[PDB]
Design a protein around this ligand. Sequence first.
Ligand SMILES: Cc1cc2nc3c(=O)[nH]c(=O)nc-3n(C[C@H](O)[C@H](O)[C@H](O)COP(=O)(O)OP(=O)(O)OC[C@H]3O[C@@H](n4cnc5c(N)ncnc54)[C@H](O)[C@@H]3O)c2cc1C
Ligand code: SF4
Length: 581
Amino acid sequence: CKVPRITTHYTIYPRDQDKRWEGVNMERFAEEADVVIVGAGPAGLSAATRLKQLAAQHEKDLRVCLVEKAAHIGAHTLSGACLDPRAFEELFPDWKEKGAPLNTPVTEDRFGILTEKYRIPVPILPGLPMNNHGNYVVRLGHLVSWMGEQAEALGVEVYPGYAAAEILFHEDGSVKGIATNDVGIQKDGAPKTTFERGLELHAKVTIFAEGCHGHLAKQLYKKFDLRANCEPQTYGIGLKELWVIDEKKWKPGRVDHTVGWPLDRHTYGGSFLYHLNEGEPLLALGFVVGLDYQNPYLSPFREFQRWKHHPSIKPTLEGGKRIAYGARALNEGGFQSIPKLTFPGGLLIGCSPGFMNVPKIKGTHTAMKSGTLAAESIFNQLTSENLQSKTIGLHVTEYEDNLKNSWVWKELYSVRNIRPSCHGILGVYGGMIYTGIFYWIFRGMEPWTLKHKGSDSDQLKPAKDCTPIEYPKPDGQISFDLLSSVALSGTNHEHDQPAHLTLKDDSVPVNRNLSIYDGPEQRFCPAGVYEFVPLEQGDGFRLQINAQNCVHCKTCDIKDPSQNINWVVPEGGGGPAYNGM
Ligand SMILES: Cc1cc2nc3c(=O)[nH]c(=O)nc-3n(C[C@H](O)[C@H](O)[C@H](O)COP(=O)(O)OP(=O)(O)OC[C@H]3O[C@@H](n4cnc5c(N)ncnc54)[C@H](O)[C@@H]3O)c2cc1C
Ligand code: SF4
């Protein structure tokens, strides 16, 4: 075999055009519901939950199906988790007696600027966006688990292990619903004796809650020109691990943040370190890097691992034990990047569209609120008559009206010029100055709205123009390698199936990427999926994709300079097995 025809997924090579599928029967069974939700995350659950609450209250019949990639609810949830109860309490005011895991109220807020050798404390005032009074630090994965339970209790039909891989359209052109991934296909594309076609879930309205950079929404944006009046979404990559530390250095309810070292003024990013108070002396810590970074030699992961060695942070994990690892991409575009949320037959909610309060690093509370509103507005239209036709799929335009008048809108508006102010000659340090001027003093009142530099993908410089970064070697106690890390994420997929990291053209990673940027996919991926392998013999290399290690963070679909990669879902159930991350 060859070069090696790295891509074989049906989305790029339709099996309706390859002979090997000549006699297979593609007939799918189908299920009818009123509302189908895609993604069992905080938003998707909020929507599902609220819809069944409304149904019960006015006692009417509502079938609500919720699909999820994860083997089980919460398995794919990754966050640091500092929660603003606002939307959650709205949905579950009775939460304290029903068991929800909000057990760590924030007690101390800290923030510092790091240099190679020192930590410079920054005062945090009562107006600023890094305040956390009345907020809780949680284990998002557990909370989501808890929510799924309530949902199930309310009568929501949850289907974990089922990934939506196809968008179903009606003949008029509106969304009819989705189809779950098929199963039983070999790495090469050929159907296995165990081939089975996925499920078809038809609804009047489909909710898309795929989170940050969902793959369905990605094609949804094109189909209905949803990004027509906004700037492209900009992202960051968040790396995280869980630690068990010395009870002596545990300070429950403390929330830490930092900026600076090991990053250079022009690379947006920082850490977060949260002391849980759920029983064990447990720490939730991480690092974020803005995927708008310029140097091809930069590695988010090596930066993270390198960060824990700062003399202000190392002592705290000194003699501790790391028990988990994971990564997820997050939104940073904020206000300027919110697209049109509705189209005939479906809605967008949560971080798929993007309601992230970047400076606060909070996107859970808004995510939930959007789910609440979505649910209310959809109930409002199935409970009425007044037909909007020639779109067999409803267009719940009222969802967007209501979202714009909620606190969500004004919250994101108020912090819209913070991230953008980081593109000055002072990089993020200038952004800090902006926060003290225009926000602490004017609470974001300024009569203008700054713009983003554009897509994160064209922000990379050619390798020959940059200097490579010399990262330390992991000591195996504070900093670890990539493979032990992937191991601690619990991620796994059936090996015999086409790689879900699809390529539009199998030649650009070697001709363009390795050539010009020196293969950045080998470093921006936090799970070592892409590697450039020497060729059997002659010269050059070949790209080897170890799809089995993918932790579904979506960073590659975002950062690839050649926008040649398109993340798609692998058989349902595959992926990380996160527990309380
Ligand atoms: C490092 C880091 C730190 C953070 N810290 C905070 C913090 O302190 N406070 C805060 O409020 N927020 C924080 N966030 C943000 C928070 O995690 C998100 O805004 C929030 O989870 C977004 O939620 P969502 O409901 O849209 O779904 P997500 O949690 O993004 O979940 C989407 C779900 O959909 C499933 N899914 C995706 N595509 C499909 C498909 N095709 N078919 C089926 N299922 C699918 C996924 O498996 C996933 O379970 C942080 C994020 C990161 C990465
Ligand atoms: S291959 Fe998977 S894990 Fe690696 S960056 Fe791309 S999405 Fe993230």
